[PDB]
C-alpha cells in the first residue's frame, strides 16, 4: 500500500505568523490519466475530517486562501501564510490515486503561548471510596503550558510503577492551557500499609520539581 | 444538501457480527462512490473500502477483506458495513463518506455521515460510583468528583445542575483493566467561596439509566 509519512507530529504556532506541513508518499501520487490526487483535510476533536485542498493545490470551497498546497510526485507540503485561532487541530493528508485509498499519520497544530507552570493539587480517596475496598488517589495538573510533564508517584518515599494512569485535556480554547489527571490506584490492603502519598511533577515552567503529599490520616 | 445519516452506537462481544448503516438522501445514490473509514482512539484513519452501489464495483482494504463487507440497498438508498469476528482493536468510530465521484467527473465532495461508534468488550453494562475529590488548604481552590466504574461510554458531568462551567476540567475517561472506564471532573474555585456555596458534581450514564448527584465538601 502507499504509505503516507506526515512531519512534524506537532507544530505549536503563534497567530499571525506562517506554518508549513510536510507529506511524504512511498510511491508517486502521479495518477495514469496524468492528475495528482493528493488531499488535505483538517479534523477538530470530536468531529469527522474536512476537505481543504484537493488535487495537490486546489482550494475546497469555503476554504480561506491563506491556505495553499504544494509539490509533486512523492513530496507535498501545506502552507498557511498566517495562522489564525481557528485553524488548530489534526491535518491529514490523503491519497486517491492508488487503492487502497490512504492518509498521513496526522500533524497537530496548536496554539503555542508562554510558559505557564502547572498549579498542582492532591487528592486522598475518599472514606466512601475506602468502604468499598479499593483507593484512588488523585494528582492534578492544572492549567500549564507546554503539554510535556512528568508526573512520579512516591509512596513512603518508593518510586511507583504500573498502578497509575494519566488522562489529558484538550488546549483550551480560551487561555491556551493543558490540564492533566494522574491517578494511582490501590487495594485498600495495600494503601494501609503506607504512610507518605506524593504526586512529584517536573515541567518546563517549574524551577526544580513540585511535591504535594499527604499523610494517610490527617 | 447531501446528508448521510449512521446508525446508533453498537456495542458488542467479542467473536461477534456487526452491520451498521448508512442512509444517503438526494436522488442519484445509484451513481455515489461511498467509502468507510475508521478512526481508533484519537488516532489514525482507516480506510476500510468503497463501495459503488450501481455495479459490482466495490474495492477493499487487504487487511480488512473477510472481516468486512460493504453492500448496498438502491431501493433504500442505504449503504451497510459489515463486520464478521469482532475483536476488542476494532473497538472505533466508524464513518461513512461520499468525497469523489468517477475519476474524471471534476467532482469533490466532501460529505461525511455522523460516524458510528463501536465498542467491542466482553464488559457489561453497569453504572458508575461517585466519590467526592474534597478541596482543601485565600486563593483558589480545586475539587471534583471521580466517576469510577462504568460501562460503556459515555458519561456526563456538569456541576450545579450546569450553572458551573466556568474553571471545570472534565477528562478523557480510561479503560481500566477491569475492562471498567474511569474518569475525573474538577473544577477550581475561590478559596473564600468554600464555607458558603455549594458543589454538587451531576452524573449520567444512559447506558445505564443511572444518574447520581454527588455533593463535594470539605473535610
Ligand atoms: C466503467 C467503470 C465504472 C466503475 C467505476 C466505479 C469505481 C470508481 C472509483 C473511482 C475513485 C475516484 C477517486 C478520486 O480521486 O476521484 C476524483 C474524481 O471525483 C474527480 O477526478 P478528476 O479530478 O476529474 O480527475
Known amino acids: 500500500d502507499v504509505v503516507m509519512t506526515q512531519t512534524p507530529l506537532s507544530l505549536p504556532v503563534t497567530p499571525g505568523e506562517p506554518a508549513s506541513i510536510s507529506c511524504t508518499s512511498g510511491?508517486?501520487?502521479?495518477?495514469?490519466?496524468?492528475?495528482?490526487?493528493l488531499h488535505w483535510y483538517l479534523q477538530k476533536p470530536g468531529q469527522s475530517p474536512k476537505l481543504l485542498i484537493y488535487?495537490?493545490?486546489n482550494l475546497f470551497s469555503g476554504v480561506p486562501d491563506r491556505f495553499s498546497g504544494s509539490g509533486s510526485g512523492t513530496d507535498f507540503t501545506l502552507k498557511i501564510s498566517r495562522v489564525e485561532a481557528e485553524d488548530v487541530g489534526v491535518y491529514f493528508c490523503s491519497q486517491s490515486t492508488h487503492f487502497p485509498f490512504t492518509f498521513g499519520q496526522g500533524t497537530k497544530l496548536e496554539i503555542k503561548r508562554t510558559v505557564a507552570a502547572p498549579s498542582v493539587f492532591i487528592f486522598p480517596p475518599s472514606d466512601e471510596q475506602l468502604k468499598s475496598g479499593t483507593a484512588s488517589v488523585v494528582c492534578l495538573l492544572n492549567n500549564f503550558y507546554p503539554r510535556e510533564a512528568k508526573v512520579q508517584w512516591k509512596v513512603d518515599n518508593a518510586l511507583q510503577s504500573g498502578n497509575s494512569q494519566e488522562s489529558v485535556t484538550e488546549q483550551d480554547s480560551k487561555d491556551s492551557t493543558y490540564s492533566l489527571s494522574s491517578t494511582l490506584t490501590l487495594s485498600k490492603a495495600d494503601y494501609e500499609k503506607h504512610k507518605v502519598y506524593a504526586c512529584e511533577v517536573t515541567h518546563q515552567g517549574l524551577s526544580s520539581p513540585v511535591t504535594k503529599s499527604f499523610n494517610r490520616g490527617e | 444538501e447531501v446528508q448521510l445519516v449512521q446508525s446508533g452506537a453498537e456495542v458488542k462481544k467479542p467473536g461477534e457480527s456487526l452491520k451498521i448503516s448508512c442512509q444517503a438522501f438526494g436522488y442519484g445514490f445509484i451513481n455515489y462512490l461511498i467509502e468507510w473509514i475508521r478512526q481508533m482512539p484519537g488516532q489514525g484513519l482507516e480506510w476500510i473500502g468503497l463501495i459503488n452501489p450501481g455495479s459490482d464495483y466495490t474495492n477493499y482494504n487487504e487487511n480488512f477483506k473477510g472481516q468486512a463487507t460493504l453492500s448496498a440497498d438502491k431501493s433504500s438508498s442505504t449503504a451497510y458495513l459489515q463486520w464478521s469476528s469482532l475483536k476488542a482493536s476494532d473497538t472505533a468510530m466508524y464513518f461513512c463518506?461520499?468525497?469523489?465521484?468517477?475519476?474524471?467527473?471534476?467532482?469533490?465532495?466532501?460529505?461525511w455521515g455522523q460516524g458510528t461508534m463501536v465498542t467491542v468488550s466482553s464488559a457489561s453494562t453497569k453504572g458508575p460510583s461517585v466519590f467526592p475529590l474534597a478541596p482543601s488548604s485565600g486563593g483558589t481552590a480545586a475539587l471534583g468528583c471521580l466517576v469510577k466504574d462504568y460501562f460503556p461510554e459515555p458519561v456526563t458531568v456538569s456541576w450545579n445542575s450546569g450553572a458551573l462551567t466556568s474553571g471545570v476540567h472534565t477528562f478523557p475517561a480510561v479503560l481500566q483493566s477491569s475492562g471498567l472506564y474511569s474518569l475525573s471532573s474538577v473544577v477550581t474555585v475561590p478559596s473564600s467561596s468554600l464555607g458558603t456555596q455549594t458543589y454538587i458534581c451531576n452524573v449520567n450514564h444512559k447506558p445505564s439509566n443511572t444518574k447520581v448527584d454527588k455533593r463535594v465538601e470539605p473535610k
Open positions: 463518506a461520499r468525497r469523489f465521484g468517477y475519476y474524471g467527473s471534476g467532482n469533490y465532495f466532501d460529505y
Open positions: 510511491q508517486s501520487l502521479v495518477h495514469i490519466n496524468g492528475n495528482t490526487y
Open positions: 488535487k495537490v493545490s
